[PDB]
């Protein structure tokens, strides 16, 4: 807190900057627990205030129901509220939230299968496609197409994508079978 106050009130001091890199680890550790606010101080002057925020406090504030309460409060003050009582409403909401947080802290005492099936089917079908594609039959294909034979090259070109489409159909059928098995 001392170092953060000094850094924020001495923004152009390299001598303090060096201390900041030296204390980078401690400051990084304490960043979640350090809370900063600004107030209109006793000297008719705006002042920074640094305080401690508890881990339990942070968790209870980040609880989803507290977030829903915050959203409802913001909606209420923005739509059905004025600037005269805005801070009064904010303080009342803060008090209610603090009480709920404290009560929750007191009372707090202490899919994958279908993904696996789809992955296994992908593996099996693509492995079958790779097995049928990569073979010693290239010599037989050459023996068919000795010469140029644009017709043969185009036929093989279309056959490759037909095989890809058939593999996709087999994979889709396997996925459907797996889904039926898991639901039954």
């Amino acid at each position: 807190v001392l170092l953060t106050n000094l850094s924020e009130h001495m923004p152009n001091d390299t001598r303090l900057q060096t201390f900041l890199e030296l204390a980078e680890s401690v400051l990084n550790y304490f960043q979640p627990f350090l809370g900063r606010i600004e107030i209109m101080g006793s000297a008719k002057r705006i002042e920074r205030v640094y305080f401690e925020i508890s881990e339990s406090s942070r968790t209870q504030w980040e609880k989803p129901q507290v977030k829903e309460s915050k959203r409802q409060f913001i909606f209420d003050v923005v739509n059905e509220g004025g600037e005269k009582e805005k801070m009064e409403l904010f303080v009342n909401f803060c008090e209610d939230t603090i009480f709920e947080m404290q009560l929750a802290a007191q009372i707090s005492e202490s899919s994958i299968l279908t993904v696996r099936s789809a992955l296994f089917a992908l593996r099996y079908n693509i492995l079958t496609l790779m097995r049928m594609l990569s073979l010693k039959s290239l010599k037989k294909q050459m023996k068919k197409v000795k010469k140029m034979t644009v017709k043969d090259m185009v036929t093989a070109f279309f056959s490759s994508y037909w095989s890809i489409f058939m593999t996709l159909l087999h994979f889709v059928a396997s996925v459907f079978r797996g889904f039926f098995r898991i639901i039954c």
């Binding site: 993904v115 789809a118 992955l119 992908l122 790779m130 070109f157 593999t167 996709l168 159909l169």
Partner: protein, 362 residues
């Protein structure tokens, strides 16, 4: 030898990639022509048959040729998509996984969430020698080694990313290696990354647009077996026209709200069926003759189906289709029943649907 084959194959790939969109438009036009012809079937009756009204006589061969052409165009559309848009998907996936590896250590620190198909499948590609094939940054493995090698283990990172430990050092010390003939066999088998191709096939199979085009091809193929399967290709107008997409965005903008409104309608009609089944069973006789009574509310499921099917579609509610309440001791209760049904199910919930559509437009 293979230079000319590769040149011709690349020429065909580029042609299909260039003409991908034009072939989609041609497929839509051929589907429209096929359906215009299909408007000319009649039933002839033993098994019945579907016969064209061959006023000119050329409709049957034209339909057969159009079906063949549509199937060929669908196959060419699949090929063109693979040539054109698959590389973009591969580039996006490679970029995403490389950035997750380098800036988050996905497979170094936190591991996939065990329910993310994308991460579980992308675990395969990291080991491949062609990991950033479409992504420009070829130094991603080196960057990950530099960032995470100091603590997590150099050898372990090398195993994770599939790169050799001291191959470069050994080659610099002494290479003593010789090349191999290209025309000789296995020169293609040893030059293809089977694991990378496996990952690519997996991601393109999981791609949504590729699946849609495969469904299009399958329906086109089924159209030869039964010609009416070509009618399913008219659904492509939704995905083909920007203005039609803008119009359908009104429906699809609040689809969740529409579905929940339908569910609420089902629940309130179920409550009305409970009330009718417990108090108004005598009024649900839907038989003209008095000899045989057709009671539509003697069973709870039958009454619920009757309400859903008839009262919702009726202009004035269930009261339009159930017996007149005049002269009964429950006349006032039944009038309230019918009026509230008309006000809630017919007037309000349908108004909720209309308002959802109009609010989506706005």
């Amino acid at each position: 030898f293979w230079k000319k084959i590769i040149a011709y194959q690349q020429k065909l790939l580029n042609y299909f990639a260039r003409n991908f969109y034009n072939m989609r438009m041609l497929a839509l036009f051929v589907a429209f022509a096929i359906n215009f012809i299909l408007l000319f079937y009649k039933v002839s009756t033993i098994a019945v048959h579907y016969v064209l009204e061959e006023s000119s006589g050329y409709m049957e061969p034209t339909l057969r040729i159009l079906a063949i052409l549509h199937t060929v165009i669908s196959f060419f559309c699949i090929i063109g998509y693979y040539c054109l848009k698959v590389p973009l998907v591969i580039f996006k996936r490679e970029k995403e996984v490389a950035r997750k590896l380098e800036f988050d250590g996905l497979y170094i620190t936190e591991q996939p969430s065990e329910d993310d198909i994308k991460g579980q499948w992308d675990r395969l590609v990291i080991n491949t020698q062609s990991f950033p094939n479409n992504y420009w940054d070829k130094f991603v493995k080196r960057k990950v080694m530099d960032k995470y090698g100091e603590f997590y283990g150099r050898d372990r990172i090398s195993e994770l990313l599939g790169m050799d430990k001291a191959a470069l050092d050994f080659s610099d010390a002494r290479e003593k290696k010789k090349p191999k003939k290209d025309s000789s066999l296995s020169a293609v088998l040893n030059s293809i990354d089977v694991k990378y191709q496996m990952w690519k096939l997996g991601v393109v199979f999981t791609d949504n647009s590729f699946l849609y085009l495969a469904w299009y091809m399958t329906m086109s193929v089924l159209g030869h077996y039964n010609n009416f399967f070509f009618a399913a290709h008219l659904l492509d107008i939704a995905m083909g026209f920007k203005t039609l997409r803008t119009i359908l965005s009104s429906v699809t903008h609040n689809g969740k709200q529409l579905v929940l409104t339908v569910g609420l309608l089902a629940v309130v009609v179920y409550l009305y069926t409970v009330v009718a089944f417990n108090f108004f069973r005598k009024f649900y006789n839907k038989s003209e003759d008095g000899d045989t009574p057709d009671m539509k509310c003697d069973d709870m499921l039958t009454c619920y189906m009757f309400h859903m099917y008839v009262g919702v579609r009726a202009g004035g509610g269930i009261g339009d289709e159930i017996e007149d309440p005049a002269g009964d001791e429950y006349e006032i209760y039944r009038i309230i029943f019918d009026i509230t049904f008309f006000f809630f199910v017919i007037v309000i919930l349908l108004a909720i649907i209309q308002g959802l559509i109009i609010d989506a437009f706005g």
